[PDB]
Amino acid sequence: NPEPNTVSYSQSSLIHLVGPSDCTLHGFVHGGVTMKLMDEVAGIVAARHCKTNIVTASVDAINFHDKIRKGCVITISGRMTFTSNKSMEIEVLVDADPVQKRYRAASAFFTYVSLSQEGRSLPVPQLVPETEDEKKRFEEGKGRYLQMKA
């Protein structure tokens, strides 16, 4: 029962220069490194939206569309897509620039939950979509939400 918010309000991103400690013995980035970055972004989004303690409930469908080489800059951007009563869905996209041309590297839907200081699960501020796509993405989210419950 707190105050609603918009996707622009919490929209967040993050830009990382693939360094050598990010990489496999060949030239590529461990999926773990990518996944951790994606979690960090989603967590920031969630935090902005709830202004509270948050935890990951589930991540569903992490897709690696392409490899990431040493010396790319990766942009990880997250935005809220749907809220239920007690949970938030956040879409995280990863793109890559070499420094070959900018491409989509990974994606995922994180699901977060808001916790009190005692550790109980809280009602979550509702997401209010405004544009066409925000209503569409919200709808698709409600869809993915229902199936996961099933």
Residues catalogued as catalytic = 39
Phi-psi region of 61 (alpha: psi -120 to 50; beta: other; left: phi over 0): left
Rounded CA separation 74/34 (Å): 9
- Does residue 49 contact residue 9 with C-beta atoms inside 8 Å? yes
CB-side neighbour CA atoms (13 Å) of 140: 11
Least separation in angstroms between CB 117 and a second copy:
8
Nearer to a second copy, 62 or 93 (CB): 62
Q: Return residues touching a second copy (CB under 8 A).
A: 12-21, 23-26, 28, 30-33, 35-41, 43-44, 47-48, 51-53, 55-64, 67, 70-71, 73, 97-99, 110, 115, 117, 119
Least separation in angstroms between CB 2 and a second copy:
10
Least separation in angstroms between CB 17 and a second copy:
5
